Structures are given as C-alpha cells and as structure tokens.
Amino acid sequence: QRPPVIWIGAQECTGCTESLLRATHPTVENLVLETISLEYHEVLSAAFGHQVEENKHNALEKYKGQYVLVVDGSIPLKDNGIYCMVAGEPIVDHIRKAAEGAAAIIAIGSCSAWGGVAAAGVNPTGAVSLQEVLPGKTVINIPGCPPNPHNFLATVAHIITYGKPPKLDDKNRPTFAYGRLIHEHCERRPHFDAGRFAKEFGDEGHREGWCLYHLGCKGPETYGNCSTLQFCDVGGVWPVAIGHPCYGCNEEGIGFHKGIHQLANVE
Amino acid sequence: QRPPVIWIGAQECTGCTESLLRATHPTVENLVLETISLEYHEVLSAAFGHQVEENKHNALEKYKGQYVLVVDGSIPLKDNGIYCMVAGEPIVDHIRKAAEGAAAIIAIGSCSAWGGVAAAGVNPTGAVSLQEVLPGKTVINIPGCPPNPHNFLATVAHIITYGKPPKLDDKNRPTFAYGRLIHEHCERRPHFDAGRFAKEFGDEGHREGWCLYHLGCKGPETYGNCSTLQFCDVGGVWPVAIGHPCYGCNEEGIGFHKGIHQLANVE
Amino acid sequence: SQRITIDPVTRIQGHLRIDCEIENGVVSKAWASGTMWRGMEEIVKNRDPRDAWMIVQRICGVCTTTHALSSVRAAESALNIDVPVNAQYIRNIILAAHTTHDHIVHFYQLSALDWVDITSALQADPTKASEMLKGVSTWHLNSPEEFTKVQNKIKDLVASGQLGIFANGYWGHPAMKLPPEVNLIAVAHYLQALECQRDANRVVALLGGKTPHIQNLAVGGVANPINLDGLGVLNLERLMYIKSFIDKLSDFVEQVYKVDTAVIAAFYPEWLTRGKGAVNYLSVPEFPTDSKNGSFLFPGGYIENADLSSYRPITSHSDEYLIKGIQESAKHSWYKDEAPQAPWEGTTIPAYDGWSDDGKYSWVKSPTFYGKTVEVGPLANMLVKLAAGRESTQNKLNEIVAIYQKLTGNTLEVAQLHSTLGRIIGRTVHCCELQDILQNQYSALITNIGKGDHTTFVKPNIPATGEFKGVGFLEAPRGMLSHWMVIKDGIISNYQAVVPSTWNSGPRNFNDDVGPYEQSLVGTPVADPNKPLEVVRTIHSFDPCMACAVH
Amino acid sequence: SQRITIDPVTRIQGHLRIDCEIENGVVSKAWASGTMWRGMEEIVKNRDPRDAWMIVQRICGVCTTTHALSSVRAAESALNIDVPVNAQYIRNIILAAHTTHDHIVHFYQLSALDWVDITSALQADPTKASEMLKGVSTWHLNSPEEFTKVQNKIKDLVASGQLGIFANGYWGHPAMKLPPEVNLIAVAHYLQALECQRDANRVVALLGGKTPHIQNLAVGGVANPINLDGLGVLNLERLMYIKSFIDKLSDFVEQVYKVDTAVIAAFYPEWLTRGKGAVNYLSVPEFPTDSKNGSFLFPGGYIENADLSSYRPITSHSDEYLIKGIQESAKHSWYKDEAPQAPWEGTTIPAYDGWSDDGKYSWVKSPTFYGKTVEVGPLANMLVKLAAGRESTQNKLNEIVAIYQKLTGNTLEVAQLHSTLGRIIGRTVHCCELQDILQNQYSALITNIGKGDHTTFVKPNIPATGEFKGVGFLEAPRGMLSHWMVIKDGIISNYQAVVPSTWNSGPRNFNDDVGPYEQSLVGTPVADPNKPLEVVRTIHSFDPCMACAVH
C-alpha cells in the first residue's frame, strides 16, 4: 500500500502540478505508480464530474488521518468564496473539509504559501494563503512560482520515509530548500564583491557572466535553493545563470510587488 | 564525410578518454558515428598490432593537413624516450610524426597540457607537456584531471562548425572553460566573505555548505569552470559542492604539488 | 428532456463546468462555464510596461511561455520596437519546444483515457499487440517485452486496490471501442510520452532559465547573453546541449504520436462526423525570422463559412483588419459592461450573480471577429495552412491519412476535419511540423552567431507622458492569443488578454450566439447520462485551459 | 615455426606488447610486456599520508576510485583508524557503481569485437534476430525495429567509407562463429551498453563529486556532509537522485549483459577448454559494513591447485597470512633489485636495458603469494565465492548455465570455468551481484541516517616520530589490489602498490615461472599468424590495465 495524497487546486495556474512533469527523482510516472497513491488530482484523473467527487469523498473516509493534502493556488475569500466554485461550492469549503482528516498539509507554490501573484496589486478576489484559511493547522509552505518539484517531492518523501516533516524555518518552509538567501549562496557573488555588474542585457559584462544586482536581482532578499539545486536537473539552469535577475518569486513582498529592475536591499 | 581525428596516448591513465563516456552532447556513440571520424584510438579500435599501426599510417597520409591530433598523458623524454614505447618506438616519435600533418593539435588533460601528476615530485621519467615536445606548433591546452569532456568536445565543435579554434588565453586554454578563477565564480564566495568556514569534514559549518578555504581549497588560484559547468550534467556535482576543497588539478604548480590542506594564496 | 452537469471536468487545465440538456439520449443544448477568476488583467495594471510579462505569464502554467511572449510582443508593439533576430530565434525555439511538450501531454495524459479502456488492456495478448504494429510504425519500443512490462504495471496497480487517478474510470462503457491489444499499446505509449515531453522541456529550460515559467525575456529581446567564448553564458557548449535534446524529440512524435492519432481515427470514425464547433476559423502567423518582427515560418489567416478557397491571409502581427475585428462581450458573463468591447477599451468589472440558463453563467467573456463566433486552435491553424497551400502541412496530413486508409480502406476529406477527430488531427500535425521549426531555428541561430551577430536586446525608452497602444499576437498551443496594452504617463493604464480558450469556451454572446464548445456538443449521443463520456470526448478535443480562458 | 609481436594490444587500458612463438599453428611460448612507466610510487614518496590518495588515484582512470580507496585504507591501516559506518556505505556505493560501469564497458566496448563481426551483421534479417531472443530475454529493446535502426547505422558508416575504429577489424576470420543475426544483436547491445554505463557513473558522480577521479574521500572517512535538512549538502533530495540512478542499472545487467554472456559461451564452447592462466587464485573480501573496517558483504580467500574444498577463507583486511605472503620480483623486469621483496621493503629503481627473451622484458613486476604465481580478478573472486558456498553466487552462475543449457543441450561444470570464457563469466556474475550490493548499501545508509547518525569523518592524528606500516586491500574490477604505506617521522617513507594486473600480466618471476597471461596463451590455436585474433581473445578475458600493472 502506498501513502495517499489528495490534491486540490484553488486559484491555481497549474504550473505547480506541471513542475512534477519535469521531475526526475521521482518522475511523475514513478510518483503516481510507486511512491504515493494519488487519490484525487483533477488534471490527471480518468474520472470526472460526479464520479471524481465520489472518489474524493470515498478517499477522505477510507484514509481519514492518513493522507497528505496538497493545495496549489490562492484561496479567494471576497464575496463569500464565489471566485472559485467547484461542483457548485466555494473551494474554501472543499479545502476546509479535506483539511479535517489530513495527516499533513502542504501549500505548494507562492500562491498557496503566501497569496502569490493572485493576491498582488489591488487583489481583486481577496485571495489569501492556505495557512490563512486553516488557522488551526500547521501548513508546510513550499514557495516559488513554481518551486523546483523536488522541494515538494523530498518533503513528501521525508514524511513517508522518516515519519515526520522535514525541519522548517519560521515561515514553515523546509530548511533544505529555503534555509538561506540566494545571494548568500550565489556563484556570482565574487563579481558583486568586485563591483563587476551587468548594466544592460547584451552588454560586455552581461556577456561575461557578471552579477545581475544592477539589473534588479532579488537574490539578496529571497530565500531559496535556485543557485544550488537549480532547475530541471540538466546542470547550470536557473534564471541568473541564463542571464536574467532573480525576481524574488519565492518571497512575499518581493516577487509580484517589486519591479524587475527595482534594486533589492542588501543586508 | 566526417572530420578525422587521431588520438595518441602517452603516459596517460585513460581518464581523459574515459571522460568521453560521461559526455552527453555529444555522447561518445554520437561522437564517433556522427561528429568525427575517429581514425585512431587504441582504447576502442577493433584492429590491433600491425593492423592498427597500418590504420594510423594510412590515415596520416590520407588526411594530411586535415586531422585533429589529440594527446593525453605526459611525454617522457628521459633516456631517449624509452619510458613509453609503442610498436618498438618512443611515443615522442609517434607524436612528432603525427603532429606534422595535423590541422589542429589538442593536449587534453593536465598531463599533456603541463606535465600534470606524471611530471610531479622528482619526475622519474622526464615527463613534459605536449607543447614542450612541439615547440613550433600551437597546442590547444584543455587541462583538468580529467577535464569535463565538453571542454574538449565544444573546442572540437568550434573547429568543425566555424573553422577555427575557440578564443584562447595566454596558456592556450579556451576562454569559455578556463577564462576565470574558480573562486571568482564560486557559489560559496558569500561564506568566504563572511568568515563562514568549514574547519573539518563533518563539522557543523561543513554540514551547512560553508566555504572550504580552510580545508585547503585551491579555487583562489585555479582557472576553470568547475563551479558553473560542473560535472556529469546531472546538476550540482563538482568537488566543492560535494563537500571537498578544490585541489587545483587544472593548474600547473597547484594540483599534485600542494598538499590537500595547504592554504591557497588569495588575490 | 433531462438536465445534467459535469463539474468538474477533469483532464483539462482549470475549473470548468459543462451543463447539457439531453432529449432522447442526444444533447440538444449546452452551457460552458469557467468557474474561477483571479483578475490578472487588473493585477498587472498601473505597473511599468517592462514588468507585465513576468506577472501575466502566470495566467497559465500549462501554456507557460505563451503569455510571457505575448506580453513582451504587446509592449514592443506599443513602443514600436523591432526585436533582434537572435532574440526571435531564441523565443521561437522556446515556443516550439514548449508546444511539443504541451501537445504530447494533451493527447496522452489529458485525452487518451476518454478513448482507452485500461481494464480491457489487462486482457490483451502482448505478442498480438506488437504484431499489429508491424508495417505501421518503426518505433523501437513496441516489443512484446515492453508491452508485457506495461501490462504488469497495470496488473500490479489494480491488485493493490489503490487505483488513484485510474479509479472509477469509464471502463466497459459502450463508447469504448478499442480491442484489448490496442488499449495496451496506448498505455505503453502514455508512459513513453512522459519521457519525450521531459526532453522537450529540457530545451525550454536551457534557454528560459527554468520551466514552468521562463525567465529569459525582456521588452526589447531576451536576457540570454550570447558569447561562444564566454564562461557562464550562452556559449557553444550550451548550444550543443540544447541541440542534444532537440534531436531526441522527433522519433516519438513521428513514430508514436502521429501513428496513434491515425489509429484512433480508424477505430472511432463516427467522431469525424460530430463535434463541429464553428464555421469560421482564425489563426495568426508565427515564428518571426527577420529583424522587423515578421517573415513568419507558419502562416495565418481567416476562414469564413468553412470556405478555404476564399480565406483571407494574415501575414503581419500589425494587420489592421485582424486588429479592428476583435471584440468581447460580457452579456452572458459575470462582468458589468455587456456591449462588445474592443480590447484596448476593454473593462473587466466583476458582477457575479450566480448561474442562470438565460442570463450570466460564466467568468469567460464572449469574443467575436467582426461580430462572428470563431474557433481557434490547431484545427484552425491546420485549415488555414491547407488554405494557404502549405506543402509541409498537406504532406503531414497525408501521412496520417495514409495510415488511416491502410487500416480502414477509406480516405479522409477536408469536410471530415470539421469535427472532434479533425481537431485532434490538427494538433498532431502541428506537433509534427514543430520539429522542423526547432531544427530550422537552431540552425539559424548557429549560422547568425557565426556571422558575428551576438546581439540580443534593444533597451527601450518609455515616454513619460502620452497615451499609446500595442497588441502582441501569438499562435499558442490552443490557438490565437493576443495581449492588449495601453500605456499612459509611462504606466499600464489598460491591459486585456483575449486568450484562445476564451474564443472557444466563451458563453452565448451579445447576440446570444453560441460559442464553439457549446455548439460542438449539439447532437452528441449520450449512452448513460450519469456518465457522459461522449460529452467530455468532444470538450477535451479543444484542449480547454480555463485559467487561460478567464485569467 | 615463427615469432610474432602484437604491439599495441588495443581495447585494453594502457600500453601492452604480447610476443608469441607459434609452432605447428599453436602458441608454444608467450611474453607479456608493459611498455610504459611513470614512477607513481616515487612521486608520492615524502608527502603527507593524507595527500597520497589524490595522487595515486591517477595510477588509472579506467579503474578510477580504486586506488583512491586503497590509498586511504592503507593510511587508515598504518594509523589504526576505524572508518565511520556512513563513510563505508558511501565508499561501497561508489565502488560498486564504478565497477558496474567498468565491467559493462569491458564486455562491450573492449571485448565484443573479438567475437563479433560487424560486416556479417549487415546480412542479418532483423526480424529473425529478434525472434531468436523470444523466451531467452525479457529486455524491452530487442525488437526488429531496434535492430533495423542499428543495422542502418552500420550500413551508413560502411557507406561513408570512413570506418574509423571499426576499420581493418577481423571481419570474416575463421574464428568468428556468430551467425549474421547474432552479430547484429551484439552491435545493438553494444550501443545500449553505453547508456547503462553512463547511468552507473551518475551514481559515482553524485557521491564522488565527479568521475573520472572522485574527490570525496579522506583518511578518516569521507567529505560528504550528511544533513537531511541541509541546503547545499548530502540531503534527502540528493539521496533520492542517487537512488533514481541505481534503479536504472538492473534491467540491462540482468536481461542483456547476463544473457549475452551465456550466448557467447553457447557459440564458442571450445573457449571453455583454453586460456587457463593459473592453478592458484586469490581475492579479498569487500564492502565492509561495520564500525571497524570489517563485516564484508563479499567473501575472500585463497585457492591452491584449483581445490575449492580446501581453500583458505580470508575475512579481514588485517589477515597476517595474506599480508605475509605477498612479494614481488624484478628478475625479468626493468628494475634493479631482483630478489623477491615484501612491499613494505619494496624498491622501484628503473633499470631499462631493452628487450631480452631470457632477460628483462617488462615494466611490470612479478608478484607471488608464498612463492607461487596466482591469478586474481573476477574468475578468482567467483571461484572463492563458490568455495565459500555463497548462495547468491551459485544462484547467479546457475542462471547463466541454464541459458547455456537451453541453447546447447549441454551443461557447464566448474572445471570449465578455468578458462577464457570462465573468466568472462566470473566478471558478469560479479556485475550482477553488485546490483544487490548497491540496493543493500543505499538502504543501509538511509536507515542509519534515520537513527540519527550523520557522522562521516574522524580527523586523524599522525605521530611525528615512529615508523608505522599500513596496507589497504580492495577487491577491484580486475582483482585484489593493495597499497602499502610506510610512515616515518610523519611522512611517507615508502609507498608500493601491488595491482591486480601486476599479478596477471607480470613477466617470468625470480624462479622463471610464467605469469597468468603468459601461461594462458600456451596451446592457443592461431589460424593466421599475421592476424592473431585468438591470442587477443584470451588476453582481453583478463581485462588488462597496464597503467595499473606498472604505475
């Protein structure tokens, strides 16, 4: 028997699910056939409509106190929950019901972890985080837009293998992935240190791999593993390595608030 | 028709050839079937003995002025070259004969680039670099013990695709791979800057991924791309990332000369 | 009649509800409803035009890349910027590789389980299955040994009693027509598809910085630093690496996906005779290759009343005929302003009042082109290419037809493409032609860099007063996308996205005309109204993306 | 009667010359000669004991890892250091994965072209070739389609007139006995082997920090920082990544390599009755799993005169009977001191004087065990395991035998393992058993970390006076390896490596007794003295490594 997972998307763009399709350890096919039992996920489920809602209800019962609940996307509270309705009910109701019997609860992505893009600006829908919707519960936050999928998969594997969550910081983020500022572990720090800065894309220093601070790099105010774990497991791939500043997508008040070219505060 | 290559090993350990078996772009099978015609290489050749030396002589004549010559290992000159004898003649003679007709000549590895480990300590065999053996030729040096194989393959590719070598530094090393000190592009530089140092393997700072300077890291005095291109194309794999200091294997006077724990000079 | 609701529709992106009235087992009327809104258009307002693309890319993570690219194109349009040709090559490689991933996932992960019965696959003979493909495909992973391994994974899953994503599927439904052996083949291909789409996104990652959600664009070009001799930048080694993944895609696409598309049509030929959504089709040209945002590798156009011979070519993303024709209505959507609006004058003022059959019932707007309903996406893009006499497209369709004819003895006529299966075929044709796009553009890049052009970015200036407008078109995996930006006093004063699933899924319009999803469902037979598989077959053929449709 | 030289011997590591006297068409006497020397033992002298491993790892890049590990074990022995158990798990995984890559490359890239004729593959029928493997393998890449693509790659290579490393090979030689179909199957497996070996080295890289030439060792344990909750260190994500590669090795090893080994025997059974190199065999136990450098997963021992029943087990790397038996002579080697030397008192003083049949003819020393010549390597290690009654080894050998039974109607007895083919078979058995080693040690590591043990390193102290002697044993891919370190006043005062290819390749010894290579060749039929394929067949079976043999 494999450990059960219930995945509910709220105001999600599906990028957080799609991250799993890039994963290699495990691949999504090994995740769903070998690592877990994915009891509800609307993107991949054979069943639809009444049949899929029946699957969820049956799972919530059969695996009460045993399943990991995962949520992507923000949860909209304005106007009594009507900005996300599934099977004729606000999503906040579906999430609260599923949370009741969960062994562990994960906010995958910046939207569920802290509101993310969907809660930015004027916040049209009163979008909030998963933790805000579940005040009595400990929500494990896995931010990024989307995070590297293994930030999530190794969090789940820690629960499965060692029987408890990984160590968390004071935002309930796993320290193995979010324990350090990107700028406090970035390969371009020597250039920062020497005042060696790209000033525009395509300029001489940009074409030598210099620091992107003066292009708006948010590495100095963003916690994450983008410079070490990076993305896609091919080697050498993250935004800064490709030539673009970090935008701060992991980090509340940075990504989606500050302009790309707005300078970060350096500690 | 594919461009011809003649590979001759002198005082080699085969690690420079073996790097090719880790390559992915191109893989070794695509290298030999699609990118080049490997006219001579003793590790993979079906032919042996008389038949393989005939392959070589024919190829040197047939592809005169067109082939790339590659050498791994140092070339031993002591006692008239008898420390490496192939088909009853000193390797230095095979190498000089092949160099006469070469379109380009590449020293792959620290041994052929500058003598490397084989020339270290008392230098029992009078081992020297490929360039020392061919004073009137421009030898392209791809150091490392062994280098990431793409430091070699993208050099060969630049020659095939655009008709000339890549841009080289004053040691004839390609700037895309060797153009910067590892320490001037090392993701642990923030820890160096803050005085956050591992003192011994397994200690608390080591287990937080701090800088390895006080363990003897030679990144401050070693040119290379180990911190960016890294190794094996899996993402995150180079010696420092795994927890061990750089030894300076790329760099003459560092690797195989200085102790692992001996501290580097910082610029 | 009987009234049914399908909520949630699964194996799509996002939140969709479909209602149907059924008369004597046949759908008589349908409603499409997007049930989630974020207000992304309002979120991006009042910011620097340069910032929009990072924020609006988050409209959708399935069609990641697409809103990023359309947004920069919109800013560039407003500002009158000509994008460097190297930046075009790079954008083009990213969009073509992304779309390859997207289409493969849609056929296998999202759609195959409408047509494939996994429990039937357990009764298959793996040797027989393999023999069925002799002379039909040259794919290297169709052996009885592969198929036996796959069958055992299925058997093991069923025996665990934990079916998960496979639980309560439509196994043994009367609309499932494939024999056991073909069901098994399809499952094997579903798993193999996952490897191919991963390779496609390795292409995307190496130029974008990651995927989902690329991070290498700019208003004015790209952030990739081209320097063949540079450490830590886009050098020849990195380019070789990208090429190594480009080369891994074609065999699966041509020998598996293309073949399975023809085979599905062979076993389900009735689905060539239903699911017609519209009589007008639009696509935009794509993959610009000059220094002036033009010279597209794929052509665009407008087809009216299914007449390919009189279609109107569109060869420029600045085409005034295209631009002036587009409007959206909210008469039956949950927004306040109902009259058709040109998107530079659009509003998105929410006005939720619950479901009403005859009133407002969706967060999707209703787009029209010169007042007509129009279907967009791969059926439209294929039909336009056929209308243009694009030989590459005609030859690729003919390859599918050839397999279909070998199996059935029948050919396919263009009339049969205006259908659920025609839509699926257009998608497959697209994915196949996109492999040549990738080769062409990789070669173009290498060649251009070799001439000494390493330029990638033109720094913009943004006037601090004045009001100006731009639009960025893109032919996305689901069809024509357009982002419409108005800049006033240096900041975004209006932003409107008109997205391909908006065209296709939008509700009844200002003249109460029915959109493509709703029209396509009229006539659908429904054997079991509790399990309306036939409805989901048709809807899935449009590849719904409701985060896109609604934003 | 005539004298031939094979120089260079190719498809080995390093520089080897083989001379043979042929009389009546059969080899009557042979000489093996290592023709390159570096003096690695002298290069490492006078250094800190802690530094040796990084230097002597460069003895060989084919058997990378092995000399690094033997060197740390030697220092640890001298210093009386017990290695942390986590460091043993990590060392073990590296060694096992490395060896997997090593053996696969040996069977395919190094040895297959002695037995396989690529010209003949062009005449094969791919469907017949696939049909031959039904019920014989469950490998998923033996389809006719796979074989056709491979055949086309050969076709195109031959078509280009640039055969490169396949040129002037032994095509049509009378000793080539495979049918066209089997030649084609072998070439396809040759190519597939390259993917599998790549995956094995991804395991090595993730723990070693790169390969070739790992960099994670230390005298006192390893440099991997274990912290499941740590950013940038060996955490649970990195461990999952390692496991994903370990999992990819088994199918190829079990369904292709293991099977091909049984098949080559079936077609070449005469090679079970030739190529006996010795009557004595030695292996050391390997893969320690306790806190005190013991509790080995694989057993070791000494077999005298081929008698398994009365063999002597070796269970400890500190076994004085093993230590005291080992000596090397340079009577017929190009060194000055000729009498047999215990390695702690060994010298390596070069004394080159050219080739003499009765004098010095090799840079390889001549090792003995209590004055006897001994074969080391996979044949030794399998025979010792059979002697020990190791069920896993029995069972794996039996699987190979059963395939051979099925194909020929004959069985294979232990007597037939003392041969060229038995040597090949022991190598394959080892590779197969190593996959269980990998699973066992990964699981042990995960379990131990879970108990709260993250220790990986104990910092050594080295007394500044005193003389201390240490020996590091390791069962390498080619056999028992030993590094011998003497420390005096804090620095290395003597360093001697006795390497497995030294045992096998070494020239006539102090008593002019013949080593295994030279012995194995007596009796070899040679159909064509100018193209002595049969000689190279036997010599390749030992997997020569001459940078190892000579250092």
Ligand code: SF4
């Ligand atoms: S965190 Fe980002 S990728 Fe995930 S749902 Fe939100 S917008 Fe999408």
Ligand code: SF4
């Ligand atoms: S500002 Fe950005 S690019 Fe520069 S050192 Fe900091 S994180 Fe790296």
Ligand code: SF4
């Ligand atoms: S450079 Fe290093 S890997 Fe290459 S031959 Fe020399 S010792 Fe071996």
Ligand code: SF4
């Ligand atoms: S001393 Fe080494 S680990 Fe520390 S920053 Fe420099 S190169 Fe990196």
Ligand code: FCO
């Ligand atoms: N493709 C796609 Fe998404 C939708 N509809 C966009 O644009």
Ligand code: FCO
């Ligand atoms: N295996 C190996 Fe190399 C040899 N001989 C060593 O040790």
Ligand code: F3S
């Ligand atoms: S924008 Fe996001 S993905 Fe990493 S590099 Fe910065 S936190």
Ligand code: F3S
């Ligand atoms: S030892 Fe060598 S491989 Fe790179 S990290 Fe240092 S130059």
Ligand SMILES: [Mg+2]
């Ligand atoms: Mg809109």
Ligand SMILES: [Mg+2]
């Ligand atoms: Mg020795």
Ligand code: NI
């Ligand atoms: Ni979308």
Ligand code: NI
């Ligand atoms: Ni070796």
